[PDB]
Fold Transient receptor potential cation channel subfamily V member 6.
Amino acid sequence: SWAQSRDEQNLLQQKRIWESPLLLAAKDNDVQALNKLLKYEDCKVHQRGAMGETALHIAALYDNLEAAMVLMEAAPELVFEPMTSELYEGQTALHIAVVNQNMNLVRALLARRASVSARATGTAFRRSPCNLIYFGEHPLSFAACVNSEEIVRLLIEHGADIRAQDSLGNTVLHILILQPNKTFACQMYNLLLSYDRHGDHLQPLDLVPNHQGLTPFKLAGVEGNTVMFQHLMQKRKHTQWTYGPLTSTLYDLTEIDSSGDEQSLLELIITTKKREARQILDQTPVKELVSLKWKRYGRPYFCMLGAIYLLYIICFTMCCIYRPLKPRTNNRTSPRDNTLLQQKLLQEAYMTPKDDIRLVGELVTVIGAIIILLVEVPPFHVLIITYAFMVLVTMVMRLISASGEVVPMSFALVLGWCNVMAFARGFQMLGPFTIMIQKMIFGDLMRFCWLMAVVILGFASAFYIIFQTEDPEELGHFYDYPMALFSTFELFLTIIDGPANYNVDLPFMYSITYAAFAIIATLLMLNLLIAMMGDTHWRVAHERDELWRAQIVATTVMLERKLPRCLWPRSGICGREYGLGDRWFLRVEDRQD
Amino acid sequence: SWAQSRDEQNLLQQKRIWESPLLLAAKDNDVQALNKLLKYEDCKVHQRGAMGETALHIAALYDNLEAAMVLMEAAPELVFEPMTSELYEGQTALHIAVVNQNMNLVRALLARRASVSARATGTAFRRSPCNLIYFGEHPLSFAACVNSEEIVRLLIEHGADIRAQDSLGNTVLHILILQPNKTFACQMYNLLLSYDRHGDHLQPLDLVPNHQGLTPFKLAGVEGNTVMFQHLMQKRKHTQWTYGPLTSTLYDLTEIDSSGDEQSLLELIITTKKREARQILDQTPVKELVSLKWKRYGRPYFCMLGAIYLLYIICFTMCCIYRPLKPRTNNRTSPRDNTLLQQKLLQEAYMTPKDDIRLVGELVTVIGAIIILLVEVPPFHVLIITYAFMVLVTMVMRLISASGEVVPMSFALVLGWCNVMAFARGFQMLGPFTIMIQKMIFGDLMRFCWLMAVVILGFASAFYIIFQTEDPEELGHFYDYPMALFSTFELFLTIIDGPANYNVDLPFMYSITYAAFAIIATLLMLNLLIAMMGDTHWRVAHERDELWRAQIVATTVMLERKLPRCLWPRSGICGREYGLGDRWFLRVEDRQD
């Protein structure tokens, strides 16, 4: 809707230039038409367009070098003119001549003393999926993005401050990484770091964060610009001796796995929604860390948590398959050939001190339940926190001592068991299968359960109307509509045997309909779900160890934020005694090929 | 952990050179800084690093030719200096100058009379997956591996003994095969066999075993260096007449299928854990043998064993489906609507001489059981040896004459039957299906049963808590927890019909949970196993006849070690009468294309 308002504003600008004789003469450089229009008669030069145009902006935008030469004699001060409002705010013609790769008015605007500190604070320049581009505010940032090297160099030779920022806090190095051209923009990164002359006594342009606190090295990791990222590692690495085909290189390891303000590089690789930024994990200075971090101190510290969780659920259940549950001494003959039960769940009979051992084993879960919430005072926490509710619920179900106690118990038990699926990630060749289950359910099945619920609410609603006629004493598959859904559900998954009596005849509309149910659902709708399962399985295993590797890291940093020090040293060997400084290093070796 | 100790030692060497002014001057060839440091003042030259450095080692290692020229005037005897300890033991600068492909100090070290017999016995040179390289001890072996031909030739012209060995017994030909460059290293194999001048009266360098007894021809087969292997067959073959497009070539067949110390080449191709070394079996002098060895004398000798095994198991079942087993005259009414039985297994009633024919047929298995153990006094022996236990167990179950006799009987029978799966390998287009079953179970299923046991110990543990309430007289799927696992197990494999009564109402938490069991397991967890089956099936049949060919050979040599001679001639025709010698040959023909 706003883009239409961008388009409604845009054509109004075209109708505006169509009516003004100056700006329509500013479309094409008809200089003989201009000098009759400009030099002879007295025309105002502040003819504003639909959003703040001048003729000086138009000839700069439609590549009229020669027409703007006439404009410089007539307009000495329209260089000092920003574009006005609502898409272009603070844009001048110094920006515009840069965007069209040159004009040599570029040289003439500075010969008329243009302002290179002009900030393009418009909406149509701000970072958005609405704009198809993003180049910041300053024309120096407009210079570096379009890959025009000498045009950049001219701005250095007129005082364009490299250390400028946008509203987002992004400097000119941050804009170069955000461009979709990756190799084509990498050469500017070397040229613009040739002009980092002083550094302003701290962070010499390569460590300056934005408003959200992002160095361009880490932001390169966030966007996953892999080609740029290898080029920034060339600066970071500091090679030691080389031994023929061997190279004892030494990566720097400074912003990777800190405990800083954003706590890592690695979590920022995880917590973005950009799927493609996880390609960095195959790159060797990061790939070596997460293998070393997981091999020693990662994997056995995980399984030591994993061994505790198995003994927890076995204990639970041991205190959940043994339940008090007297024989039925209460109200007897309420099930008149009807809802059967005889246990009724003992009130406070906590005698027989085998039950005191059970009372010990019950308290093992309860104390362990509080620990999980003492962890989680702030896709698998949603298992274990909902595990932590139901253990607390089933004790409140015992302190109040109500009746409906199995209904939180069954949520508690199977999610307690199915949460050790999460522990199968640290047992390699079992990792991404848990990723596969998440890919089936929230990726394919929940956008397919809307298809199965259509069919199943037809036939179950159908069969209730067919078997409204019959005595459900024979053929009790559809005695009522609530279980009719459940009864059709496993005919749909080929479990219930198919309702057939053979003592009496069936009604005639049943035989057609349940046969039509068989064709449309038993072989067809079921197997088309299986091919969706069979499609995504081949999608995962073709990228297997990748999503295994992404599983390890996000597990690892999550383990670090909830485990203290003095049991975990920060990986990579230290400095200051081997004599480089507080930067902590790790080395890696390679053959040439 | 040791690699960190390699890295902790490595940076300490960097801090060591950082503090010493001589070695830091030995980093870059600042000769004007050196002559003030060396020629003017008196500096010791035995400045040892963190593991035994000299400045003579450093300039040799960081490619300072000119700095080492100053070192030769100052240090006449540091050429005679090995690297000291714990990674580099016995390494001198004569080794180091070789590794950097030249220095012409290479010529000058021998001009200072360097020792080419120096043995690099360090840990960081020994064969390991910790080291990324392996080049032995002697610098002649360091010369040939880096593919520097004239630098090799210089060592011949100063007395480098080619016949030297490492601690492993590997000569210089063994190192050339172990390099990952295959074509790039093959040219050294011709050049170094140009200098096998005498041969030391026996094994002229091409038949010298190591400490584990490996000729380089056979070791080429063990590592599967296929490109090198074809080049070694060029030496072995001895071509006869050629007839236009025909070529009556004649491969040598000496170390392939011996009865020597390592009993073959072929078993060594099998019993390595290297999967890729079985690529040799497609190469034509070996591919022709195993086809000829299996076509005649391989296949019908296998099926003659296979015909015996079928009549064995048929005579096994014949004395196992007829069992003595009286009617129940003993304790009657112990199953109070409970565990039923009426046979109780007769003690010693061996009358009715039809049973004596059974007593004959029982002794057929027992004698045949001892033969299998008389074979196996020292993945399918584990079938037949466990077959051999249970037949012995079921006779000890008869001599003691105990009761629990069917429990070893059922292990005995189905593994007796399923061991003739192994006999389907010699019946082409049935071979690799038995390989597929091993690929499913130990390759995919046992790294997936840990996933199924998670789900199945939830829901079976769940349903026991749901159906703790109910009378199990109706709906006896879950009367107890031990059979509750078995009852959920075939709901998981879509066998048991789904527990549904329709006389009474079911408990409410059942209907949700068993429906949730249906979604997560019946279509989802089951079919994702099937796609794993459907993945590896396409992996096997794409490489079908390969793993069929590997199946034949490992079957064949296993048949040779347990069958004597005078029924098996060693294949390939003989010599000494056709006039070449004791080497036994086989010929093969080919069109040009």
In short: Chain A is about 50% helix and 0% strand. The first helix of chain A runs from residue 2 to 19. The first strand of chain A starts at residue 242 and ends at 243.
